[PDB]
Design an enzyme around this catalytic site. Structure first.
Site, PDB file in Angstrom:
ATOM      1  N   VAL A 174      -0.063   4.484  -2.749  1.00 17.99           N
ATOM      2  CA  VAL A 174      -0.509   5.823  -2.373  1.00 17.99           C
ATOM      3  C   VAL A 174       0.408   6.888  -2.958  1.00 17.99           C
ATOM      4  CG1 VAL A 174      -1.821   5.160  -0.334  1.00 17.99           C
ATOM      5  CG2 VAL A 174       0.652   5.415  -0.203  1.00 17.99           C
ATOM      6  N   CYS A 218       0.818  -1.206   0.000  1.00 20.19           N
ATOM      7  CA  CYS A 218       0.000   0.000   0.000  1.00 20.19           C
ATOM      8  C   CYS A 218       0.853   1.258   0.000  1.00 20.19           C
ATOM      9  CB  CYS A 218      -0.976  -0.009   1.182  1.00 20.19           C
ATOM     10  SG  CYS A 218      -0.291   0.228   2.818  1.00 20.19           S
TER      11      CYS A 218
END
Ligand code: ICS
Ligand code: ICS
Ligand SMILES: [Fe+3]
Ligand SMILES: [Fe+3]
Ligand code: NA
Ligand code: NA
Lengths: 522, 476, 522, 474
Positions: free
Chosen positions: A156, A152
């Site tokens: 992002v 993740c």
């Protein structure tokens, strides 16, 4: 203290009197713990009609989820290809977790690398990680293919996997012809099954998209088989077993059964078996492509239909009697092979076990959870067995799925008292097994803490756990089992009926109290 | 063979690309008694080279996993996507006494379960909602911590404002912890970040306290996380010696115990790496001294009991010898049974930040020889201490790669390997006995005298197990 | 009383208050029952060393035997031949018992006939019962072969089976060429396994003895396999699977796998599969004959060596790791086929499971019982697993067998606290698990009443039963399992380690009391 | 029907040889049939080689009658087969501490070897009796259930019993129930009833201690299958009666010994217990009546008939019991009869149930198209004629081939029989319920049992598994 001939581990060592008094003094002296009667009052409150209603009002807090994150599934998907190293572009801590998660379930090594993107990579991107990562991995662990996903952190900040891999080839960190399929797998989208779908499509993308001009549908006279997120070795093996029995040419796309079960013969094998790169390049020449778990292979489906031009059959997961029947009949239609005497007999033996065991299974109530395809196949089989799937929980399910499962419950009188829950977790389920108590739970190892809670209210209220699903950490070698096809239906049937009989034996073990029903023959 | 270990080191480096070859050369060393500098044999606490399959974890594992998780009467929020809280759910055996779900919550997984919508707008509003829902469904929690995962800082959220606003709103301790996995190089920074979060938001809550009845023998166990009961088997011995353990950090620890730690007379530090930070602060702010100790094996435990007792008066020293004399026949029975079964066997270790050096004496108490140890995230002061524990010419490795660790085993051929879950099944398939030195292979405790019996029993059952004779088919 | 939506079966209906008081008044009014404290006193006495010494002085009384009578095994042996009707010359009550005994273990039909010998046969013999019996059975049930054994009544009065069948053919009740093998199976000699041996030898006698002149050893390049008394379907199937994998021509002599597992597809099949009469006629032309359970196949052994001139190898039952190795190595030598990669890998997978589960198996103590070959194979495997077979009981074993097992225990440090008992029954074993408590029992369904007794003394003293053996009546479909070869060793390993861990979970389920050791991962 | 059954009967018989065909013609009947003698023969030798479902006289004595007596130890005298195959196979439920004061599910046997055949087992039995007394001191009597060889070898277990009984002041009952005696379990019932009479029943004839009441009663011929007798005595005692004894289901020796004191013997199983019932009428004057607790219709008819044998208070409490359970069994029929109405059932059981459960099926709207017995007599078949309908099929000691063939043509929706038949017809796609062991369910007696019976018939008849016998591709 210890007696040398009889060493006590933590249990029951800490039940010794001196350890018990010390634990009592630690609590009363310095813990400021709520009095026991306050604890008992609240525990009883947590089992009530009231608590559940508040429990189901949750919108922000999740407690005890029944799902993992995308890149976990991307790793499992990548392990099913020959000499392929799964590679997660992002932070290292994820990979240690992915590896440990699968280590404990399979009791086997799980090879996977990170590119160790750090605080600095957050500010200027992780392209240098990619170039050095690929080069090191290729040189050190010598894979024929590196299948790249993301943590993740990478998602992002916006690292472009496509450009990063291309620049790694441009500047000569890896050869230009070396296969590096990739897929973005944001952990804040979907769940672990979505990462499996994204990864497989990326890999199918890599070996196919630019080579369609030479492809003729059906020229290889084979059927492609896409298993999806699958953690039972017997499920890979039973599918290949049934296809070979039928004499059906097939290609299992992503097949990790070899790497997840290497022999202990004095050497460590990092890679073993798996789908070959050629099988991926030749897949468009198949008659069709069958998705074994279509409810988390949606993107793959669109690519198989959009690019390979295959008309993917509408098939449920091959679980239980009817859906294995439908799977075999559809394969027969596509391949032209008849269903052989061997598979027709195996079916009749499963039906035979249903007739011999129906008196103990009938009306039994179950709470269950798992991934969408696994759950609905378990729902269908329980109905075929005369059982009631009272609590059906799927944390990573959606509305369309819930409607398909609700339609199934409506077509059987044993779905009368059943409710399908999506987006709910195991704390939600805890409430359900207290308020609308079933007879058993069918779920993964996390469910052991729910039986824990039920026993505390009373033995009368205990709901024993039947371990089917993922992950199973507190038993050994259940990952070898089978849940698909007739063979898997036979294993599930036996486990269920014998869990019922073991519980009956427990409740009728009390001498002169209840052992009038402690029958030798059941 | 120092020459052969150094040629083994170069040989294994010949596979790497040059940048990886220049870095890994600095983390692989051969110990030499003429040198305890560390700053001249090995480098540590650096980057993990990309793509080399590090055994390391992240700063979240170092904060939520290691230090904060075990605190039993607080609820710890894994703030972020679904992964971290789930992969860490009940993975470490930080044992505790409590009613889980009611007044204790260690084994549970509380999380905000970030969706894309929390990436877009931010998770600060969701966090305040979650705090309230925690308060509705788990009224008996005595505090809340928010363990920041990767995206929290990335997207620019302010968990500290939420914590102060909600903390004041509810008059509850809410601890913001900035342990995002991308910070640092390993679990180590999570220890430091978590120690500072304890200091800033919990430790000072009773600075004006004057009720705590103090004794001259008050002590705290710092850096024992009660793996399989390790701290319980250590506390029995200190209190038999006459001491009063006010608190244990974080194994079976309560927030009140943490808040009472400034009251103690002496801080007993087991895990130096993860807990030296807060120990220095309590010496600077409250004047409480701290000392390191070792409860692995009878030799180190006795040495530790006598050093701790020497920091008090004659009565405690007298009881110290009473404890030693009481357990003397028990651990002697353990050595008499198992040391003949383990003497002369060689062990290779690779663990985290303390145990790679701390358990050596126990192996030697059973007569085994540690021919190789290493840490995932140690610092040069951890390696300075390892140099006085390790033997001459043994191999040391920092943040070892899976390829490096495999190759090293192939040449050295130890009789036993002690490491982690991701390494266990590699070497078991190679026919080398393996014991997990993190979770104790679901055995333990290994601390104290009671733990040495289990440790010795565990090493015997695995190294001498009949299964290891059968790796080669009789027809091969 | 009953609640319509929740009907109570005998359990827990009779726990209702009105039933409890009724049963109390029945006891106090008319049972003249011993006082409860006298019952407790005697129960506690029956658990003591004192009592055990008296228990083992028994010479005449047998209590809770762990064996059946000969003709039971003769029936099972006959059911393994093609379209063969087992036929027990004697009284009819035996046959109803034999069939029901096998009905409940296999949950399947069991075909077997009797010739209803009455009180009148005591005075004039059962020859008219043989003539009419054969004719009726042959005409009604259309068997291709009728395999004849005897009940104990026929044995005591001295019926000449040979003369009776020969005269039945002479006077035209059955055709002269109709196959009617026979074997005397006195229930007062040996046990059920002896009847299997006697029947098989009779059948081998019938088809070969008068035809040995045309026989050349090894001309059909096959290996003969004699399974013996075998009640696990998977054991027949794993032997045939491994030989087919090896490419070894074989003949399974007596193979009931088909008739004991027919599909429920709308019709009842009285016969299915089985060894053909030819495979018996041609068996002397095999390279050799391997006895799978030699300790109850001695009569067969002498006939295969005396008449077929085969050199029967000295092989233990293929159970566990070493003995499956030896079984496969001997088959390879006789057949000239090499052991294939598939079986070498399967072996490494079993060893891998041993390495993954040894920490929970090590030192675990077991009390076990069963037939001689099954028991010693279970002993051997338990020693390979680091477990201690403390109580080894074989009610129908002999002295030489005990000596072979004692030698096995002496060659391993895990047989140090083990004792082998022959001629002792399950009342003897009950005493042993009290005075010298093990951790688990491995035995058949009769062992459930021993765990019952142990729990009554206290939960601390309960010895849980692990169901392996014959008969298994209180669980469904365990007869489908496998105990031989690597596959059977894999099933036994998994069953054992998970029984240990399920008991650990039970003992650590008490919240705040013992659940500190209620680990998610084990 | 009628000619359609009669032709099915001859059609199936054409496969037999003529001697078996002639005999079996006499045992197959279709229902002026007040007299069994006249349309079917029963209680004869079984034909050899035809696969009879019958058992033996040992099963009739040890299995059914003596075994259930809970405070006595029953010795299977002979080889190991008989005691082992019948160990805990019959669910004669009881309350007791097994191994200490109760022994029903254990297996005591002399385990005959050839030495005992040669020299005789009389000395071994006396030694065994002593070993029983040292290890099981709380047994209140011993029975010796002779297996086949005992009579054939010339033993004298009566002398052992008489000699040992005096030395130990213990009740030792010799039972000559060798399996070759008789044609079935029937003679074992008769042999066991006489052994009770001769060695147990008369021990308290001169003992007038027991305080008798006018409402004292005994349950004769209920063996408590799944608790059948417990679900029956509760009704009798709610009616105001005192059940002094149940024979042999959960029965104690003291209970049996007090039976001569009762005012009325309630006979459920006429076949196995009519012998001792007539004897207690001759010697002690106690009358006896038959009754039926299968289904609400028969139970009510039985409660009112039993009550009519007493005074107005008992008849009054009878109507109170009936009114109490009326809504309960009405809810059961309201739930289950719609799901079972119009369904046809074929039965084949031992000596009473083939007629005793017909009313219960009809209470759920089912039709018994065929019944039969293993070992019944003509007085059992006389009673069967009134219970069965016109044109139904009757069969005595049916052959497995006969029973299969009959099912193939009749095609019932449910079959009620034993364990040896269950898996045959399940494979044929016909729902099957065991009417011996109640398929490990029950009880089926009384109002509480009707609820279980109805639930059991429903769960099996309507089970989804039965629609899956045919693969969709054939
Ligand atoms: S805290 Fe540290 S990796 Fe000191 S992060 Fe790690 S429960 Fe290890 S060597 Mo797992 S510095 Fe503890 C440790 Fe040691 S989790 Fe445990 S075993 S003594
Ligand atoms: S005793 Fe008889 S065969 Fe009347 S021998 Fe048999 S427990 Fe049957 S039809 Mo098994 S005359 Fe009882 C019987 Fe009926 S064993 Fe049970 S069910 S009501
Ligand atoms: Fe493994
Ligand atoms: Fe079956
Ligand atoms: Na991470
Ligand atoms: Na018999």
């Amino acid at each position: 203290s210890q007696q040398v001939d009889k060493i006590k581990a933590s249990y029951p060592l800490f039940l010794d009197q001196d350890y018990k008094d010390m634990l009592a003094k630690k609590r009363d002296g310095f813990e400021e713990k709520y009095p026991q009667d306050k604890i008992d009052e609240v525990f009883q409150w947590t089992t009530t009609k009231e608590y559940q209603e508040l429990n189901f009002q949750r919108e922000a807090l999740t407690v005890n989820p029944a799902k993992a994150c995308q890149p976990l599934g991307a790793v499992l998907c990548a392990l099913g290809f020959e000499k392929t190293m799964p590679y997660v572009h992002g932070s290292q801590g994820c990979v240690a977790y992915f590896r440990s998660y699968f280590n404990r379930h399979f009791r086997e090594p799980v090879s996977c690398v990170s590119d160790s993107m750090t605080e600095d990579a957050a500010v200027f991107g992780g392209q240098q990680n990619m170039k050095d990562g690929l080069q090191n991995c290729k040189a050190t662990y010598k894979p024929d293919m590196i299948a790249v996903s993301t943590t993740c952190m990478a998602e992002v900040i916006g690292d472009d996997l496509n450009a990063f891999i291309n620049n790694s080839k441009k500047e000569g960190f890896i050869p230009d012809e070396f296969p590096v399929p990739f897929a973005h797998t944001p952990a804040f989208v979907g769940s672990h099954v979505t990462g499996w779908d994204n990864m497989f499509e990326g890999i199918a993308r890599y070996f196919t998209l630019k080579s369609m001009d030479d492809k003729v549908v059906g020229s290889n006279k084979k059927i492609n088989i896409v298993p999806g997120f699958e953690t039972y070795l017997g499920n890979f093996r039973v599918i290949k077993r049934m296809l070979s029995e039928m004499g059906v040419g097939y290609s299992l796309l992503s097949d990790p059964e070899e790497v997840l079960d290497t022999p202990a013969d004095g050497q460590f094998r990092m890679y073993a078996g798996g789908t070959t790169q050629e099988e991926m390049k030749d897949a468009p020449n198949a008659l069709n492509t069958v998705l074994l778990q279509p409810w988390h292979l949606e993107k793959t489906k669109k690519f198989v239909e959009g690019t390979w031009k295959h008309e993917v059959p509408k098939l449920n997961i091959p679980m239980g009697l009817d859906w294995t029947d439908e799977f075999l009949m559809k394969v027969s239609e596509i391949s032209g092979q008849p269903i052989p005497a061997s598979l027709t007999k195996e079916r009749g033996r499963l039906v035979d076990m249903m007739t011999d065991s129906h008196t103990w299974l009938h009306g039994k109530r179950f709470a269950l959870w798992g991934d969408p395809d696994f759950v609905m196949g378990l729902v269908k089989f329980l109905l075929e067995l005369g059982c009631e799937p009272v609590h059906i929980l799927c944390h990573n399910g959606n509305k369309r799925w819930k409607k398909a499962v609700d339609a199934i419950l409506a077509a059987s009188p044993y779905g009368k008292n059943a409710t399908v829950y999506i987006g709910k977790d195991l704390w939600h389920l805890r409430s359900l097994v207290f308020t609308d108590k079933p007879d058993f739970m069918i779920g993964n190892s996390y469910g052991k803490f729910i039986q824990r809670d039920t026993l505390h209210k009373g033995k009368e209220f205990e709901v024993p756990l039947i371990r089917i699903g993922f992950p199973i950490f507190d038993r050994h070698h259940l990952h070898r089992s089978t849940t698909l096809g007739y063979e898997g239906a036979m294993q599930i049937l036996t486990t269920l009926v014998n869990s019922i009989l073991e519980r009956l034996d427990e409740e009728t073990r009390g001498m002169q109290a209840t052992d009038y029903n402690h029958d030798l023959v059941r | 063979s120092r020459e052969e270990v150094e040629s083994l080191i170069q040989e294994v480096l010949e596979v790497y690309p040059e940048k990886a070859r220049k870095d890994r050369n600095k983390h692989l060393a051969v110990n030499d008694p003429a040198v305890t500098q560390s700053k001249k044999c090995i480098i540590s606490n650096k980057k993990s080279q990309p793509g080399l399959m590090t055994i390391r974890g992240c700063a979240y594992a170092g904060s939520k996993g290691v230090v904060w998780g075990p605190i039993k009467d607080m609820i710890h929020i894994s703030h972020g996507p679904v992964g971290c809280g789930q992969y860490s759910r009940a993975g470490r055996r930080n044992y505790y006494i409590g009613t889980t779900g009611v007044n204790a919550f260690v084994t549970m997984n509380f999380t905000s379960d970030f969706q894309e919508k929390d990436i877009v707008f931010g998770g600060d509003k969701k966090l305040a909602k979650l705090i309230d829902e925690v308060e509705t469904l788990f009224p008996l929690n005595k505090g809340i911590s928010v363990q920041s995962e990767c995206p929290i800082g990335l997207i620019g959220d302010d968990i500290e404002s939420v914590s102060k606003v909600k903390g004041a709103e509810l008059s509850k301790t809410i601890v913001p912890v900035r342990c995002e996995g991308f910070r640092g190089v390993s679990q180590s920074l999570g220890h430091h970040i978590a120690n500072d979060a304890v200091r800033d938001w919990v430790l000072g809550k009773r600075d004006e306290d004057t009720t705590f009845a103090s004794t001259p023998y008050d002590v705290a166990i710092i850096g024992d996380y009660n793996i399989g009961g390790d701290a319980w088997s250590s506390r029995i011995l200190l209190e038999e010696m006459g001491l009063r353990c006010v608190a244990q950090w974080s194994g079976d620890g309560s927030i009140s115990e943490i808040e009472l730690t400034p009251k103690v007379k002496l801080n007993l530090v087991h895990c130096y790496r993860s807990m030296n930070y807060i120990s220095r602060h309590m010496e600077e702010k409250y004047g409480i001294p701290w000392m390191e100790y070792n409860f692995f094996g009878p030799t180190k435990t006795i040495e530790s009991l006598r050093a701790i007792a020497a920091k008090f008066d004659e009565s405690i020293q007298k009881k110290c010898e009473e404890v030693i004399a009481k357990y003397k026949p028990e651990w002697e029975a353990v050595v008499a049974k198992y040391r003949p079964r383990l003497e002369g066997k060689r062990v290779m270790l690779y663990i985290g930040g303390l145990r790679p050096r701390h358990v050596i004496g126990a192996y030697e108490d059973l007569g085994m020889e540690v021919v190789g140890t290493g840490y995932e995230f140690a610092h040069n002061d951890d390696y300075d201490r390892t140099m006085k524990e390790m033997g001459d010419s043994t191999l040391l490795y920092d943040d070892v790669t899976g390829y490096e660790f495999e190759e090293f085993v192939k040449r050295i051929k130890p009789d036993l390997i002690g490491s982690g879950i991701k390494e266990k099944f590699i070497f078991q398939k190679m026919g080398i006995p393996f014991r997990e030195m993190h979770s104790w292979d679901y055995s333990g405790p290994y601390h104290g005298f009671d733990g040495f019996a289990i440790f010795a029993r565990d090493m015997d059952m695995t190294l001498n197990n009949p299964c290891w004779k059968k790796l080669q088919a009789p027809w091969e």
